[PDB]
């Protein structure tokens, strides 16, 4: 599914991401925009042989199992395919564990490089929340 901006903001809020670990909704939406362009089916292969999955580009080395990433720890206890579903619940659950892991949203390099310190409130402009 390719979410609209406000549609994804509403879904994230409904799944308890708004201000999770102190990160406002706009941070999450901005991160999704630059990780996946709001496309739940996005997949991308990393240089280390792992792959990133879903709206927030969660990896298969630490977080989910894809069966082809040696050293996989699967800390989210989820097949990586679950992170491609139209329903964002599995991605949100796993992202909550990621953002709690010590470095906050710096876990997402695109967040650090494109969202951190910017006017992230713009991502929720006009939305009926
Ligand atoms: Cl915000
Ligand atoms: Cl933090
Ligand atoms: Yb990646
Ligand atoms: Yb559902
Ligand atoms: Yb409200």
From Swiss-Prot:
Record-listed substrate binding positions: 101
Record domain C-type lysozyme: where: 1-129
InterPro entries (UniProt xref): Glyco_hydro_22, Glyco_hydro_22_CS, Glyco_hydro_22_lys, Lysozyme-like_dom_sf
GO MF annotations in UniProt: beta-N-acetylglucosaminidase activity; identical protein binding; lysozyme activity
GO cellular component: cytoplasm; endoplasmic reticulum; extracellular space
PROSITE patterns recorded: GLYCOSYL_HYDROL_F22_1, GLYCOSYL_HYDROL_F22_2
Tissue: In the egg white and polymorphonuclear leukocytes.
Top enzyme category: hydrolase
Annotated EC: 3.2.1.17
Keywords: Allergen, Antimicrobial, Bacteriolytic enzyme, Disulfide bond, Glycosidase, Hydrolase, Secreted, Signal
Cysteine pairs bridged by disulfides in the record: 6-127, 30-115, 64-80, 76-94
Pfam (any one): Lys
GO biological process per UniProt: cell wall macromolecule catabolic process; defense response to bacterium; defense response to Gram-negative bacterium; defense response to Gram-positive bacterium; killing of cells of another organism
Keyword Chloroplast: no
Active site (record annotation): 35, 52
Reactions the enzyme catalyzes: Hydrolysis of (1->4)-beta-linkages between N-acetylmuramic acid and N-acetyl-D-glucosamine residues in a peptidoglycan and between N-acetyl-D-glucosamine residues in chitodextrins
Cellular compartment(s): Secreted
Keyword Hydrolase: yes
Protein family (similarity comment): Belongs to the glycosyl hydrolase 22 family.
Function field: Lysozymes have primarily a bacteriolytic function; those in tissues and body fluids are associated with the monocyte-macrophage system and enhance the activity of immunoagents. Has bacteriolytic activity against M.luteus.
The protein's assembly and partners: Monomer.
Extra facts: Lysozyme C is capable of both hydrolysis and transglycosylation; it also shows a slight esterase activity. It acts rapidly on both peptide-substituted and unsubstituted peptidoglycan, and slowly on chitin oligosaccharides.
Name this polypeptide is given: Lysozyme C
UniProt organism field: Gallus gallus (Chicken)
Protein encoded by which gene: LYZ
